[PDB]
Ligand binder design. Sequence first.
Ligand SMILES: [Ca+2]
Length: 579
Amino acid sequence: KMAFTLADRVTEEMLADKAALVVEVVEENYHDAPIVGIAVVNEHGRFFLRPETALADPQFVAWLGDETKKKSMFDSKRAAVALKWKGIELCGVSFDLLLAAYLLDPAQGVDDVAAAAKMKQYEAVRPDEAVYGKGAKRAVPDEPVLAEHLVRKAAAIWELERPFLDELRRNEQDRLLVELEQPLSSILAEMEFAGVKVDTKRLEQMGKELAEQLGTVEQRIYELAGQEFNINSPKQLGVILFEKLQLPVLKKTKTGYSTSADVLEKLAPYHEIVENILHYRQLGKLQSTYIEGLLKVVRPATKKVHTIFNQALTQTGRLSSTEPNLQNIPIRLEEGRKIRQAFVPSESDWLIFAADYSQIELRVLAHIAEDDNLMEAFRRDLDIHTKTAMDIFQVSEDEVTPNMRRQAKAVNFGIVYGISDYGLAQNLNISRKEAAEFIERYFESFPGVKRYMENIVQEAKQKGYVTTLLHRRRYLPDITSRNFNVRSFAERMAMNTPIQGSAADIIKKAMIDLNARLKEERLQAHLLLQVHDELILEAPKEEMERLCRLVPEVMEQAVTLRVPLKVDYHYGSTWYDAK
DNA sequence: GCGATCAGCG
DNA sequence: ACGCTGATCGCA
Ligand SMILES: [Ca+2]
């Protein structure tokens, strides 16, 4: 039905200075994936190009790389990274419909052009699932069907830029889109394509030793149970723990007994088997997720892994990382933390450099709540996580172990995000009356934080949503629910989303400023990863001293709050050693 | 496919 | 009965 030119070659009217562009990559993981077709829509008409001709045409390649030739797209990072794997640079992306829809409403779950278009009553385009199919039936349709679908997606983007930009402007989000999310998308594309080199010899050797240790722990388990059984079957595990050994039942799931790590730690005084089970799960988690799982996604020729940073997924404005997830590599236990020895620089005589914001969300909270005592604490550069551990465990600063500080950390965030006295009691193995009175003492020291929690909930009720410092938005319809439990979850979102989301705004701006500064200084240093409030770079070892001065300062000056921001940083031969 | 579990970030 | 995630695994 929709008219377009099925081109056999590239003509000049296809190369206008504004166009909607579709560069179609059907595989979910777009690294090194086929480009199946290209569509262009501009003032001169609608065009479909086969990639084998468009991407070898020197005028089309120059047009793609000309930043003054402006393109509107959906998920331009998918396109940009797929084009890098074809050796082609995409520049000039001035509107991204995926990122525009994400800002307007992250809960929509927009995953293709049709779902974005539906937000503005535009329905002249089919969902990608209807054209390609689902699961094992996924297939590229034949050329006529493929080309009409790509042209319809391009025409939708063409028509939708203005009504999306208009609503972004009304929401105070247009500069958020155009100066933050869209430049960040090109930086993530570079990070994803650079990848992270992995020491596969050391990883495989760890995997060998691990399997030997797994079998040993597994036999002490069978010997402590007096019998063999399946350690990962809840049924058989419940029989050993709760019927055979007759341990107390502290917690049930919807399917039966709970055996989560918090339950098993509480059972450790009763029987030695439960701590062996914990060691066994931890060893097994490393093997399946961080050894085997990681080797499966290493590209063998370069020994690099290439994550995908989902930039339009989380409800707070955070990124997520997938296949592999490089944002949850073990660190807390020494056995798992050794995994990070396998992440190495991509050139000899380069180093890994890591920089991290200190107590980022509490500094953001101090600023947003304008709490006098919390603002003073950070103006003194106090370590609030350590101070809370001193108070909890009634020890001195010199005696705070890494674990107590990590514990107190869950206490600080738990309290400001609405933990109940019950929840706090369970978390610390203390009484519920002592839990409630600790919480009341905590808000007596920080009355501005308490006022803020009450006020933000009220504002969410009035407005129907909450916002972050850079005007990211999250709608909270459940805030006025008749159901107490549904309303309560919404109130804790109203307490947490402005703080976590503002911390996400800040590090994103820091990344944009960092990239610009590295380029102005003509350094080879470049970002590899973001881990929510941490940035990880690699660079020639001769740039490290300049990075020690440049990176902390760029991150600390990304925004100006009522308290200082503070950055810790380390560098070394591996990711393990950058700490 | 989902729920439980557990790895990270706060 | 703090929040935000992704990968794995058994299936009660
Ligand atoms: Ca931090």
